[PDB]
Design a protein around this motif. Structure first.
Motif, mmCIF file in Angstrom:
data_model
loop_
_atom_site.group_PDB
_atom_site.id
_atom_site.type_symbol
_atom_site.label_atom_id
_atom_site.label_comp_id
_atom_site.label_asym_id
_atom_site.label_seq_id
_atom_site.Cartn_x
_atom_site.Cartn_y
_atom_site.Cartn_z
ATOM 1 N N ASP A 1 0.820 -1.213 0.000
ATOM 2 C CA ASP A 1 0.000 0.000 0.000
ATOM 3 C C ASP A 1 0.856 1.266 0.000
ATOM 4 O O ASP A 1 1.778 1.413 0.805
ATOM 5 N N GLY A 2 0.538 2.179 -0.911
ATOM 6 C CA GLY A 2 1.319 3.390 -1.089
ATOM 7 C C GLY A 2 1.066 4.459 -0.041
ATOM 8 O O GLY A 2 1.962 5.233 0.294
ATOM 9 N N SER A 3 -0.157 4.506 0.473
ATOM 10 C CA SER A 3 -0.526 5.468 1.506
ATOM 11 C C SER A 3 0.385 5.402 2.744
ATOM 12 O O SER A 3 0.742 6.432 3.318
ATOM 13 N N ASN A 4 0.756 4.189 3.147
ATOM 14 C CA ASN A 4 1.590 3.988 4.330
ATOM 15 C C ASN A 4 3.078 4.160 4.035
ATOM 16 O O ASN A 4 3.887 4.324 4.947
ATOM 17 N N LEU A 5 3.428 4.107 2.755
ATOM 18 C CA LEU A 5 4.808 4.279 2.312
ATOM 19 C C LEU A 5 5.251 5.736 2.499
ATOM 20 O O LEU A 5 4.409 6.632 2.558
ATOM 21 N N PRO A 6 6.577 5.974 2.583
ATOM 22 C CA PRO A 6 7.135 7.242 3.075
ATOM 23 C C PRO A 6 6.585 8.537 2.488
ATOM 24 O O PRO A 6 6.250 9.444 3.248
ATOM 25 N N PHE A 7 6.517 8.644 1.173
ATOM 26 C CA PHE A 7 6.021 9.871 0.569
ATOM 27 C C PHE A 7 4.586 9.757 0.098
ATOM 28 O O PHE A 7 4.064 10.652 -0.565
ATOM 29 N N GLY A 8 3.953 8.642 0.420
ATOM 30 C CA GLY A 8 2.643 8.380 -0.128
ATOM 31 C C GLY A 8 2.858 7.578 -1.385
ATOM 32 O O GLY A 8 2.051 7.618 -2.314
ATOM 33 N N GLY A 9 3.984 6.868 -1.417
ATOM 34 C CA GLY A 9 4.312 5.969 -2.508
ATOM 35 C C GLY A 9 4.602 6.716 -3.793
ATOM 36 O O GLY A 9 4.675 6.130 -4.871
ATOM 37 N N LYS A 10 4.773 8.025 -3.672
ATOM 38 C CA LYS A 10 4.966 8.865 -4.833
ATOM 39 C C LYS A 10 6.352 9.478 -4.817
ATOM 40 O O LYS A 10 7.136 9.228 -3.905
ATOM 41 N N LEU A 11 6.657 10.266 -5.840
ATOM 42 C CA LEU A 11 7.828 11.128 -5.807
ATOM 43 C C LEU A 11 7.372 12.493 -5.328
ATOM 44 O O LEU A 11 6.440 13.068 -5.891
ATOM 45 N N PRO A 12 8.012 13.013 -4.273
ATOM 46 C CA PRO A 12 7.609 14.310 -3.719
ATOM 47 C C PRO A 12 7.709 15.438 -4.725
ATOM 48 O O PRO A 12 8.451 15.333 -5.704
ATOM 49 N N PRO A 13 6.956 16.514 -4.487
ATOM 50 C CA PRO A 13 7.106 17.767 -5.234
ATOM 51 C C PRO A 13 8.534 18.285 -5.095
ATOM 52 O O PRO A 13 9.229 17.896 -4.153
ATOM 53 N N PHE A 14 8.954 19.143 -6.019
ATOM 54 C CA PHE A 14 10.372 19.424 -6.230
ATOM 55 C C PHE A 14 11.166 19.915 -5.016
ATOM 56 O O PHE A 14 11.956 19.162 -4.445
ATOM 57 N N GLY A 15 10.948 21.160 -4.610
ATOM 58 C CA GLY A 15 11.822 21.783 -3.628
ATOM 59 C C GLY A 15 11.577 21.411 -2.175
ATOM 60 O O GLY A 15 12.242 21.927 -1.277
ATOM 61 N N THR A 16 10.623 20.516 -1.947
ATOM 62 C CA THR A 16 10.154 20.206 -0.601
ATOM 63 C C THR A 16 10.997 19.214 0.203
ATOM 64 O O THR A 16 11.182 19.388 1.405
ATOM 65 N N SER A 17 11.510 18.184 -0.456
ATOM 66 C CA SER A 17 11.923 16.977 0.251
ATOM 67 C C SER A 17 13.359 16.987 0.762
ATOM 68 O O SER A 17 13.857 15.937 1.177
ATOM 69 N N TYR A 18 14.034 18.136 0.676
ATOM 70 C CA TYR A 18 15.421 18.290 1.152
ATOM 71 C C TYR A 18 16.408 17.599 0.230
ATOM 72 O O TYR A 18 17.607 17.575 0.504
ATOM 73 N N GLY A 19 15.897 17.003 -0.840
ATOM 74 C CA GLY A 19 16.745 16.363 -1.820
ATOM 75 C C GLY A 19 16.634 14.860 -1.846
ATOM 76 O O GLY A 19 17.223 14.218 -2.709
#
Lengths: 252, 48, 72, 48, 48, 46
Positions: E30-48
């Motif tokens: 399940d992607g919901s429980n995965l770290p980013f929501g199983g997605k690739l985060p938006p650009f400048g947000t994720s600290y890299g």
């Protein structure tokens, strides 16, 4: 190398069978090909023939020989397109969609050229897109739809019945110039016969399958009496799942 | 095309049943044509 | 004899080819029929056994079925 | 060499232990739980 | 140590499992429980 | 889904897990099917 090899030629392995004579004749044919390519680059209009999704270098399996299909593709259809281009330039219809040419030229005698060419262009396109070379088995959901209408107390009776009604409709169009469509009226299915120079979009239906009933379509293979055999084979080669996703998109 | 002709003629009835049928006792190993059939129908392959 | 056999080997290689094919056939055929019949009958009795009485017992109570399967 | 020899030996033993455990001579893909998780007595015998 | 927490190919693997496997044996990520929501985060947000 | 016992919970109430059955042709314990079924589904594998 693909760009450098002319349009018709096939690129293959040398078997060293070529005598120098025919080896030179070939280069001369290539030179001519380059010349006619230079003039076709400038003769190019707005509209163009569709790229075929399946290889037609050999015939279309169980349906057409190479010569039949390539007499449709490279002879009649490309003429239709030359006409369409000649008459959509220098007019208010320059550079618009195939639709907005079909739809804005609908039912007028003055623009009959533009409209006829346009609708034939569409029909041929949709015909090519309606042929899947080895055929396909009609999907469950579409079968469920068709059965609720055509089916009388039989298993996928709707399939034999639809491929019957198509035959009947085809034989009942006497002029042998035109198209037979399986379409969605938006409230029900039916099999409609369009005359040459008419199209399902012009009558605002949603097309599912196309069958080409022009005599020029079946003449080289099935002769003049061979229409029944022709249709029967067409269903061996038709594309059902397309008709299905169009149907389902129409519904929602 | 062969795929759907088969899936049309076989119809509903059991794949395994069909395999025991299409082999009389001395014909061929059932495991072999069972394997090759499975690999041909799904995982589409050229049939052995 | 050597000139002869050599000549007809280099000229007509496939006589020996087919000769060896048939040799091999007549050698290995009956083992293969045994394997075939055995496996086919395997899936055969395995297949018909699903309509037996034991299966009629599987549906009414499964727990007795599995229990006497693990002990049985 | 001699790691490989020992290694190969114990493999051979372990596998002819699993696949036919009763030494009947034919390959068995449904081995008992005792033959699968069981340790070779040859190891103990070698220590001894 | 940062690769396993995010199931990488999870949507593909889910698709494969759901389509080709019996529901008695399948593991679904399940992607919901995965770290980013199983997605690739938006650009400048994720600290890299 | 019904009131039947799978062989799974038969094992849980006996406490054998999946490992003990090893000489038995069953692979998937959690299906509802007979032993013969289990044999025919896995037959081509061996």
């Amino acid at each position: 190398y693909h760009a450098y090899v002319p349009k018709g030629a096939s690129v293959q392995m040398g078997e060293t069978f070529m005598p120098s004579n025919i080896a030179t004749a070939v280069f001369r044919e290539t030179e001519a090909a380059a010349a006619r390519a230079d003039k076709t680059k400038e003769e190019t209009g707005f509209f163009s023939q569709p790229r075929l999704n399946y290889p037609v270098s050999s015939g279309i399996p169980a349906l057409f020989s190479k010569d039949q299909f390539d007499m449709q593709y490279s002879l009649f259809h490309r003429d239709v397109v030359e006409t369409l281009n000649r008459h959509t330039l220098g007019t208010p219809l320059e550079g618009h969609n195939l639709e907005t040419v079909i739809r804005k030229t609908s039912f007028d005698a003055t623009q009959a050229v533009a409209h006829t060419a346009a609708s034939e262009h569409f029909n041929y396109c949709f015909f090519y897109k309606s042929l899947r070379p080895w055929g396909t088995a009609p999907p469950p959901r579409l079968r469920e739809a068709l059965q609720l209408q055509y089916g009388t107390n039989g298993s996928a009776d709707a399939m034999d019945e639809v491929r019957r009604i198509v035959w009947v409709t085809a034989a009942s169009h006497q002029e042998r110039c035109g198209w037979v469509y399986l379409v969605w009226s938006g409230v029900h299915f039916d099999v409609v016969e369009f005359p040459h120079g008419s199209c399902p979009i012009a009558s605002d239906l949603i097309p599912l399958l196309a069958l080409n009933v022009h005599e020029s379509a079946y003449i080289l293979d099935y002769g003049t009496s061979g229409l029944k055999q022709y249709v029967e084979n067409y269903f061996k080669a038709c594309n059902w799942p397309l008709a299905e996703r169009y149907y389902l998109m129409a519904i929602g | 095309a062969l795929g759907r002709l088969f899936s049309e003629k076989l119809g509903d009835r059991d794949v395994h049943q069909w395999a025991v049928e299409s082999c009389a006792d001395g014909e061929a190993d059932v495991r072999q044509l069972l394997l090759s059939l499975h690999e041909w129908r799904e995982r589409g392959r050229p049939p052995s | 004899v050597e000139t002869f056999n050599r000549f007809f080997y280099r000229t007509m290689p496939m006589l020996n080819f087919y000769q060896n094919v048939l040799k091999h056939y007549s050698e290995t055929i009956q083992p293969l029929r045994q394997a075939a019949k055995s496996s086919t009958r395997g899936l055969a009795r395995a297949l018909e056994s699903e309509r037996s009485a034991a299966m009629e017992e599987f549906r009414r109570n499964s727990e007795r079925y599995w229990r006497n399967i693990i002990e049985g | 060499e001699g790691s490989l020899e020992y290694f190969e030996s114990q493999y051979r033993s372990a596998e002819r232990a699993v696949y036919d455990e009763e030494g009947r001579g034919v390959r068995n893909y449904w081995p008992s739980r005792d033959a699968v998780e069981g340790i070779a007595q040859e190891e103990e015998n070698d220590a001894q | 140590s940062w690769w396993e927490p995010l199931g990488y190919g999870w949507e593909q693997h889910n698709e494969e499992q759901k389509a080709l496997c019996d529901v008695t044996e399948q593991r679904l990520i399940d992607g919901s429980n995965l770290p980013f929501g199983g997605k690739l985060p938006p650009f400048g947000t994720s600290y890299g | 889904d019904t009131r039947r016992r799978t062989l799974e919970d038969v094992l849980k109430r006996l406490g054998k897990t999946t490992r003990d059955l090893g000489s038995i042709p069953i692979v998937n314990p959690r299906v509802d099917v007979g032993l013969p079924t289990h044999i025919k589904r896995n037959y081509q594998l061996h």
